[PDB]
Design a protein around this nucleic acid. Sequence first.
DNA 1: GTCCGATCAACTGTAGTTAAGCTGGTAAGAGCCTGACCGAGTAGTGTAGTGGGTGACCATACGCGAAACTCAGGTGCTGCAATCT
Length: 140
Amino acid sequence: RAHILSVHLHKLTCPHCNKSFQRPYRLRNHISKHHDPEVENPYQCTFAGCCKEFRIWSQLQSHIKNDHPKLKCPICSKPCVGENGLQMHMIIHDDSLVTKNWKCHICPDMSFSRKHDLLTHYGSIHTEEDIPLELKYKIS
DNA sequence: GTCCGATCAACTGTAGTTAAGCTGGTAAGAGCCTGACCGAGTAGTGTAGTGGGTGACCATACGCGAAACTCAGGTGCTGCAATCT
Ligand SMILES: [Zn+2]
Ligand SMILES: [Zn+2]
Ligand SMILES: [Zn+2]
Ligand SMILES: [Zn+2]
């Protein structure tokens, strides 16, 4: 895989000056300046569904760090991008919309009908230690 | 939808606030490439299980031949009798 990407598919080289760069990111920045079109805003947001464009690389660095920070779900630690990403993923845990089933983390048999009732099993066969966070998190 | 016409400022007459860069010695933006660090990507891998087809060995079958066994053919004398003498 490395041989193909270093002897035949020269993807890390400039299309114009024939320098090369240690990551595609720096090649992109290089093309955006040293071989740039007459465009006023040489930088464009690299992320999903974002259409914004910028004059100086520092403003793009700021925009990525502000509006596309890479987060982990507070409950399930799965990664997501930006405020919308977190708010979209938080629906999955929501007990008002997602009228989910109720089970033990270990015991195969459980089949509760309400959240308060599920805490009886975790309060007796387990205890207040090693209950799952989605059950515990009365955060709203 | 349109009608009147009041009315913030559109577009119209002159009176007074903004850089650029010179002498310098200088630290300030905006920056570059090698390097390091973790997350994720490319993708062949590591046990583990379902199926199939090959191979060996058997026995079952007929069909031709091989020897078996049963029952009746065949040899040869002579005890007894009859033809020729
Ligand atoms: Zn180049
Ligand atoms: Zn963006
Ligand atoms: Zn979550
Ligand atoms: Zn249990």
